[PDB]
Amino acid sequence: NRAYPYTRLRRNRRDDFSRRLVRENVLTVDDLILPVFVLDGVNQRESIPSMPGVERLSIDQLLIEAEEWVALGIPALALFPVTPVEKKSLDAAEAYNPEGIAQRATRALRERFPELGIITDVCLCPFTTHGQDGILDDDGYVLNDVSIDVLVRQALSHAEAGAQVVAPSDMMDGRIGAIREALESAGHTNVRVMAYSAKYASAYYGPFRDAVGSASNLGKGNKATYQMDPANSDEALHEVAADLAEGADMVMVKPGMPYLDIVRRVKDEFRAPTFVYQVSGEYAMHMGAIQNGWLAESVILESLTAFKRAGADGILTYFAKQAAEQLRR
Amino acid sequence: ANRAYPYTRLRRNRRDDFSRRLVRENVLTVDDLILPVFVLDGVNQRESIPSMPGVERLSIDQLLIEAEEWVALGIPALALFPVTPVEKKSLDAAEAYNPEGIAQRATRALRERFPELGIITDVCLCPFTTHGQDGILDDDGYVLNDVSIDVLVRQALSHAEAGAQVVAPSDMMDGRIGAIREALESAGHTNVRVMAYSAKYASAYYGPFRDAVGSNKATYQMDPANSDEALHEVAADLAEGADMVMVKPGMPYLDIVRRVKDEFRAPTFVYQVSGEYAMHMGAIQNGWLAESVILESLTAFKRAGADGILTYFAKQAAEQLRR
Amino acid sequence: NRAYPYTRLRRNRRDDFSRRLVRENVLTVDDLILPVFVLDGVNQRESIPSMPGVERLSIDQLLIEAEEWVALGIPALALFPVTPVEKKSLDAAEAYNPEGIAQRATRALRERFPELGIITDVCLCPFTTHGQDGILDDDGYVLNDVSIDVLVRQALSHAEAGAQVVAPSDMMDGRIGAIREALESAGHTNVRVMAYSAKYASAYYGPFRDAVGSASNLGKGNKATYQMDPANSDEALHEVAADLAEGADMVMVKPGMPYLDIVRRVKDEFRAPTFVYQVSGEYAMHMGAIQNGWLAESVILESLTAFKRAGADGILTYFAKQAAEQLRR
């Protein structure tokens, strides 16, 4: 029965102190995960034109930059390997190569910064000649269960490299359970599985496909037989329920700001650790506008606060370092 | 319901276009689209807006030309924003209720020429104040609530008199929806709808609009951190007589859309603001994102529970939907 | 606290534009599934007096008519074979004959129109001399588990013919799970199962039994030991929960408009892909009245909009072509 003018919702807005007292959500560095593009070789740094301010880094250069990310208190990195073209194959075998970029990077980081979380990507897209997330059948369809067998080997390779978290981004049915079963049978009892549970067939990924180098491979291909239809919301709840049942320790929605309603429903429905990925296209859009002088740089912390408000526990964001820097002040 | 792999494989419905179509939960249609327009003072004039690539400010005659195409595409309504000449701004904002102000003129012209097209006028003082704030300022520089409302009510009445089917208070004063509703009923404007901007945030995403209309607000616009508060905003506005309620900005607040729809089951609108437009269009023009993101962003609003979307993409989208 | 005259619910009704903006549901062609009665032979077309405007078609004639249904954007057909009397048996073996009408029709359509969805009917009613949905015991009771064995063979035959969806309409307990288990073990991983979950023992089916030719066989028989009591609503939720658990990809209520409350409860409770069948008797009633001049032809789109409003994702309707034609304008 709250009614004007007895209730004037502006009164708590009148002064900073009161806005602060009633403020419902804050972003902190504990919320931030920095995705990073990792090159083969030594002394390599490459600018990504469709992600201004983000560079692909060789492992030695990654280790250097990580000193500052650690000093800033960023909890974890999410690694994405930029696989050399010649190491792409129909069988995606590079995915489980102990000498692959992801596995070498993991080992290096785990030794140099033992408290830093490493989240590896479980997916065949960086490894396939066609750029799809799994292995194709003779009709060009991404086979579910055959792909899982490769994903499982990948995941085990990561666990062997020391990754504390593996994050299946492939959208095969059942892969969370298969990976978990494998990790448990192998003794990797504490390796976390951060499921990409509600990952949509989105247009917002374009820049990442450029950054990881799968854009050329995929071409005009689409992922609608596995990634989710943008139109669907209830379906996301079913996706997440399965992944929880299958043993996921964290569940993720991707992309991010275009899907904040999904973040809210998922958090509300399951009350489980919920993550969101602020994808390459989101980062690019924001950067492009800030660089043009169309949006103030305050939009970065507004965008990230939105995720907290919607119910995410953690955010994968290419803004993680700038945000951590702003928070540190 | 104990759904478990492999008895349940959620990919099966995704296998084919036909089954994707059958199960698709939401669709965007032209019926969902409302186009905001920036309206100039002369004749035979258009102006480009540096921070909104592709959007033109339009004099009324130009508006009427373009509206023929908008109506033909089935866009149901426009939301008008006047670009007030500097010389007509004042501390009292009286131009807001001038019967020959741009908004009022534009409205009468449109109502006569396209009687089926909905016209949503903006009730707010920000295009009219020397200072660009949304209400009348006190000596400390604070936006005065109830004094501002008196101006707003006069504005809204002038819009009604001009023929506006919908007035949309975007000012975020407390209690303004009720005051406006009371004045419209008392004047006999029994069917003029009020589209409340109920949960309007103190956002950085509005920068380009200020460039567009030619016009610090944390004492009235909402803290981006706050979600529960939006439900209290909305509840008051429904009780006060709003016919529709709106969340602004849009994409950055899709969670609020969903909560608002779910809690009240009332006609719910969302504003895809100038900065959302600009970042999308900038990225598409830079070749960084595909054109397809336009419809993906609009489908998100529908999925989140919006009934209608105020969007600078309305004509592009309507075109895409007609193909 | 909404109260007159502050709140006048007529204001949004005042003008078309505002009614359009606030309109809660729309029907689109993406919602439509056309059931079709399929004859043996060549060059055969037969009018059904109790379903005015609907014809039984031989496969060649079906293929011709399907060009227009495809051009209209109708997503799928649901096939119902008109089995020759001489091919009815106690064992219902025709149900799994690779040369049966349903299996031949499926193969023909899958080749001619590869994007068109084909939903086959899994049920023994077109195949039994007695017109019941399963195999009878020596007391005249429809045996549950023995019937499932035949249903399973049927379903596999359909999958082998290329059907993208099989739709068990039999109301045996457990058949969704048994069919799913069979499809999975045989490698038909992506064959959808559209369960008739809440199918009631209704009087509204009379015309269909005429159209498929099971009316004579069933006679005065009833299906109350398997189809649901019209009086029961909570029971429908239990029926649907089982079918979801058993692996259904879609769940259906039948009949349709007489059961819209069930559609609403099912959608609300499970948030799963929900379908509704506007049965023969519903079509006949409406057609009869329109032909008499008692109801305007606008009732067709009103009837279909009701299903959307009640929460159905898709509608099996003999009006699918007229509706698609009206929508296309």
Place this chain on the structure above:
Amino acid sequence: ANRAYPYTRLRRNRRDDFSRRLVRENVLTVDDLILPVFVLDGVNQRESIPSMPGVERLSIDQLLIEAEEWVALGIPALALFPVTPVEKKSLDAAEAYNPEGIAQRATRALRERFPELGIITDVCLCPFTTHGQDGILDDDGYVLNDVSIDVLVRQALSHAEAGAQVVAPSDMMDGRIGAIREALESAGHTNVRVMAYSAKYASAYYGPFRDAVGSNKATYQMDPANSDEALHEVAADLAEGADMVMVKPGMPYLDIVRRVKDEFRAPTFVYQVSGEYAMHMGAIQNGWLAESVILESLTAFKRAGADGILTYFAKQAAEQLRR
């Protein structure tokens, strides 16, 4: 969601600090903290309080000195409690609305010297009555509801006149929130917040506060047994116009905090009272518990759903948070 060991091992997230940090559901920040202060009548005076180790009563000048450190640490607000000289107590409690009473003086001094610091004044008669009860007594010794409210309204207005941004009625009279709100609106104090002590229990945990301010209540304060009743208290106070609602005591009533937050989704505060403070500080000083319990107790309030916490630990906590 059918989570089952060993597919689900809830220890995995606990394995490492980084994953503990990622999933941690609540954090305390300085923004959550409100420091209650006991304010004396002279100059250059502090007094120690036997039952609140480490808390000093402060004359206004001393308050202003300490407030520089409080503001520097980012504490958003103070809640003032005057220590009335015995000679100013009376049966009518008139000192409550004296414009040169301690609270009023302290407020004007603070508002001038630290304009951004929030000042929460106490609306209650207990520091002012010869008898120490929270309202005016009838011949049977019963606290009179509506008579007491009239005094309270005059008090609240005097605080508003002194510049208080928030008045916090702690009296537990029925209907006082509405009466105060009505009087503030009618006087033009449109933005003075009211922080209702909505669910305030008849508790043994207040003993040390009475020692601190220098001041049997089961006919107005709530029965500790009752939970549902708290929701009815809160609902009335929201309807009456409260901007914030409070549960007191705190830790012993964390269930009430949670229910109150969950039911109303409104700005919810909690008072970690003098006895909670004393038992913690006594135990820490006795070496029986680690200092870490301070932040653990404060994190509990956040977890339970409180937006802000009135706590004598606010400065210690703010210090810990700044390291």
Place this chain on the structure above:
Amino acid sequence: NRAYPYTRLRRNRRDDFSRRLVRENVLTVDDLILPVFVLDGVNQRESIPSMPGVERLSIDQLLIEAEEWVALGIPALALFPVTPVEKKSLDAAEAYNPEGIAQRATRALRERFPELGIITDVCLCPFTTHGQDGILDDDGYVLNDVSIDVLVRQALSHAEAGAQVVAPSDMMDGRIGAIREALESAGHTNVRVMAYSAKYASAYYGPFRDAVGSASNLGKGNKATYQMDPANSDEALHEVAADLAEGADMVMVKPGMPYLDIVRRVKDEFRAPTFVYQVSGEYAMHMGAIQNGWLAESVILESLTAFKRAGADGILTYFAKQAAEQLRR
């Protein structure tokens, strides 16, 4: 629509009789469980300075004191053994010694007071040289499944001694199910399992670690890799759901008053028998203040009533005897 002055919530508060009629919760002796620290040897009584008024008792002295606890109607005791330093080991074997303090005490009490409930503690902390709750790996981490094997042997030893309830306080994943499986396979069909489901990594346990003598062993060690983060609430619901599924007969939150919100959520969500432990630090805080004259002795019954109000069925409290004495008046 309740509004002043039609509704004045003070009216039921006006008189004792009406406060009594509407009083929502009462504490009774049926709610009380007394934890007790048990020494080896004969004729031993030891005061605990950080728990004023509580003594560690040898078994003969326990039996004497139990006469009064039984006369007061206290339903159950929770036993905590003060293990001799020399009987601590890396393998925690003393935990399952049939001649251990807990097992001897159980047997003695079960014979002397057959109606008195005995709740034994299942945990390795009193038995390990390092004071952690399980067995450590070579990185110093408490191994989950190896620890469960020892916990299981412990639990079986208690059941063999006659304990009616075993209470696992160890916070290993899955231990409820493993213990239950063991009890059932051994024929201990009616031995209750009182799970410590939501046991937090708290500072409030200090005095107990002194009383049981594990303080020296643990040193500065922490239990954050198994006990719950104080910040987390939703996580508690997941913890309890697992333990119910695994067969717990009662579920517990620990500590107590600092976690009353958890008690409320757990009771509300599961409607199962819910217990709360008013830990050593809570008892000490209260006692310290009462002894200083800072709080009246009425705080004891206020503190206990809080637990009832929050939804607990039973309370483990070192105040159980004083409270029972006050209630008996």
Place this chain on the structure above:
Amino acid sequence: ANRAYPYTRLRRNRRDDFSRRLVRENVLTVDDLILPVFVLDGVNQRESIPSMPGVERLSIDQLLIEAEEWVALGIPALALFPVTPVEKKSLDAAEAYNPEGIAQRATRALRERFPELGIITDVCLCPFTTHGQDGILDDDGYVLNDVSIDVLVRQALSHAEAGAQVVAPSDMMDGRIGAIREALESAGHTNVRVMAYSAKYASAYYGPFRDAVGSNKATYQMDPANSDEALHEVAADLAEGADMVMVKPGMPYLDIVRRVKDEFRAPTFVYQVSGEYAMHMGAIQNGWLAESVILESLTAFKRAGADGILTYFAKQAAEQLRR
């Protein structure tokens, strides 16, 4: 929570008395009990009631004697029902508001002699009308709603004047709770509680009460078939100002108790009526049921969610609870 045999055996908690006690969800205490009394007009008089074995009508002096034992047993309150002499009945029911009527006399006597004992008076015209209906009849023999309320308000005021702490309108007129509340507030009886008989059914279980007090109602009392309707009854009575709400009869309506408690979370009472009493006591006296059914029936009310129970078994139960 996937509890399944044999991991879950619900018998384990049942194995032993101690664990049965630990998990027992509800307990009856003396605090739950309210004893209804039938009060006669002379002196040194008691009468037995044929259809209520063991219950006596008591003159006031006898009431006072017995009340010493009731108070000693801790019974919190009595509910008085006067046995009006035939000569004082009338079509206007004026005896209802006679200051020297039985109820009023009994109340003053009790309030003086046992000031802590709660006195609940009956507001209803049925003991006062020549015809025994609960209100004033029109020419068609219909119980007039608003006319009856005027009498009821005068009655209630007379009870307040006599010292009653609680008035309990049992008449089932629409809107009477509000009318009574308004009149009590307007007269200054600010703390007189109103215990609404909110969901009072047109039941066959009342037969023996009519024998007891010496006093067709389907146009005002509720249809036993109806459950949802009870929630609407209760909601109105809370909004109207009831302090407590009651369901009558009791056992035959335990579902209503539970729904009422669950929906409103307000102080909820239940009447174990004369016919419930009689069938139990008759069966116990016939040797067909054990005495234990008394406490089992009372525990049911607590389990169903009642805060207090009006019961002719209150003294027996209190005695059993004291052993």
